[PDB]
Amino acid sequence: MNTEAEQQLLHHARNGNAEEVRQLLETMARNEVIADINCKGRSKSNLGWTPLHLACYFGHRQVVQDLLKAGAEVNVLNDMGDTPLHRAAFTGRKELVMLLLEYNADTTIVNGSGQTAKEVTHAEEIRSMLEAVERTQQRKLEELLLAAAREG
Amino acid sequence: KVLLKVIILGDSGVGKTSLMNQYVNKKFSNQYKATIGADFLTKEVMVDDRLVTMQIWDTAGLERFQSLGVAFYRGADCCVLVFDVTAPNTFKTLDSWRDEFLIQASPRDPENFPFVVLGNKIDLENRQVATKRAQAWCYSKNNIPYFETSAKEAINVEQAFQTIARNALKQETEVELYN
Ligand SMILES: Nc1nc2c(ncn2[C@@H]2O[C@H](COP(=O)(O)OP(=O)(O)O)[C@@H](O)[C@H]2O)c(=O)[nH]1
């Protein structure tokens, strides 16, 4: 099951209650409550979503920024295969994408449907941003593979 | 011409099926609730000088399986939340019905996605959920329009679906699906 603390984290992150989120994170940082910051929702209202997925999808920037500052994993996957970046890009939230990209989100991750974040968005500025980063990550990955294969 | 998909959600027994038949067939009957429930049901209506075909999906199948809700809610244009005015437990669940819909239907603009809330069965005694309480909740959720209804006595059923369609049509005019 989920702990009361991480049920509070899922609820406040989904609802954009930024001060309650931040207070929880300070308690979790000081090891005064049991709560995984990367917890997966376990209720009907959030099954398989992390607090970070919820806040990106519903557009709560202060929550996202506190979760990222607190060490949340940028590349968590939900039951659909989505990263938080898929959700922010799908909903056309340019600044959230900037933040996720800034915390080194992997853009090459393909969701359950076969789609990267670049190709679930309808905002042309986000698409361009993700295309630039994806090509950059792809080239860096291909050279690391090619090197590591030419040389054990 | 244009097609609107409408989801109807709520704990079983709030009157979802009965509201459907009242809107569409002008009748109070919840018969065949395992063939049209968890199934479409259709009505050509006129919506602000636009001829709409409205598909109304009953959730009465209501399988816990999240896998159902994803493709079932997929591409919904409006979502109608229903509770029993005489059953307070059915009003408390509206939060998770709305949330479950939003993360499974996954519309591009959740904060503006058109919901309507129906407090059904207002033709009874001992209505245990107060009007002001439900309007407080509805406005809390970005001013969802709220109606008290009776599928049995046909009260505010047509009115609510006029609003449903209108608001859904301002959201489907953003995507465009004619026929
Ligand atoms: N008095 C009254 N009873 C209703 C009303 N709407 C539905 N019901 C009754 O409540 C029960 C729930 O009906 P149903 O439509 O099957 O609920 P569903 O499972 O939510 O689809 C049925 O026995 C209906 O006769 C209403 O507006 N007024």
Nearest CA in chain B to A123: B108
Instruction: Report resolution in angstroms.
Output: 2.4
Domains held by chain B: number = 1
Tokens of A146: 């090619």
Distances from the Cα of A67 to the Cα of A61, A74, A79, A93, A99, angstroms: 10, 9, 20, 17, 11
Burial of A70 (0-12, 13-18, 19+ CB in 10 A): middle
Domain locations along chain A? 1-73, 76-152
The answer to whether the CB of A89 falls within 8 A of the CB of A99 is no
Separation CA A9–CA A23 (nearest Å): 10
CATH assignment at residue B117: 3.40.50.300
Amino acid, res. A39: C
- Least CB–CB distance from B100: residue in A45, A58, A92: A45
Same fold across A1-73 and A76-152: yes
Technique behind the model: X-ray
Considering all CA atoms of chain A, what is the largest pairwise distance in Å, rounded to the nearest integer? 52
- In chain A, residues with a C-beta closer than 8 Å to the C-beta of B70 are 80
Cβ atoms of B169 and B4 closer than 8 Å: yes
Closest CA to A107 of A99, A98, A117: A117
Please list the residues that pair with B15 across neighbouring strands: none
Q: Which amino acid is at B124?
A: L
User: Cα–Cα distances in Å, from A87 out to A35, B49, B109?
Assistant: 23, 36, 11
Determine the CATH number of domain A1-73. Answer: 1.25.40.20
Write out the two tokens for B152: 């049995």
Residue in the block written with tokens 């959730």: B59
- Inter-chain contact B70–A90, Cβ cutoff 8 Å? no
Structure tokens at B95: 């939060």
CA distances to A46, A77, B14, B69 from B66, rounded to whole Å, are 11, 16, 21, 5
Best of B94, B99, B101 to disrupt the A interface (most A CBs within 10 Å) is B99
Classified as helix, coil or strand, A83 is coil
**Residue B52 DSSP one-character state:** E
Is residue A36 within 8 Å of A67, Cβ to Cβ? no
| CA B108 and chain centroid, separation | 19
Q: Which two tokens stand for residue A43?
A: 């209720």
CA distance B125 to B67: 38
CA distance B130 to B152: 20
Distance between alpha carbon A74 and the CA centroid of its chain, in Å? 4
The span from the CA of A22 to the CA of A17, in Å, is 9
The answer to whether residues B109 and B99 touch, using CB atoms and an 8 Å cutoff, is no
CA B128, chain centre distance (Å): 21
Domain encompassing residue B37: 2-177
Angle at B113 between CA B112 and CA B115, to 5 degrees: 115
- CATH 1.25.40.20 is the classification of domain A76-152: yes
Please tell me the total number of residues recorded for chain A in this structure: 152
- Answer for the pair A65, A43: CB distance below 8 angstroms, yes or no: no
Q: For residue B94, give the H/E element and its range.
A: helix B94-105
Best residue among B7, B14, B18 to mutate for probing ligand 1, ranked by most atoms within 8 Å of CB: B18
Ligand 1 binding pocket, CB closer than 6 Å? B 10, 12-18, 30, 33, 60, 120-121, 123-124, 150-152
Q: Which residues of A touch B141 (CB under 8 A)?
A: none
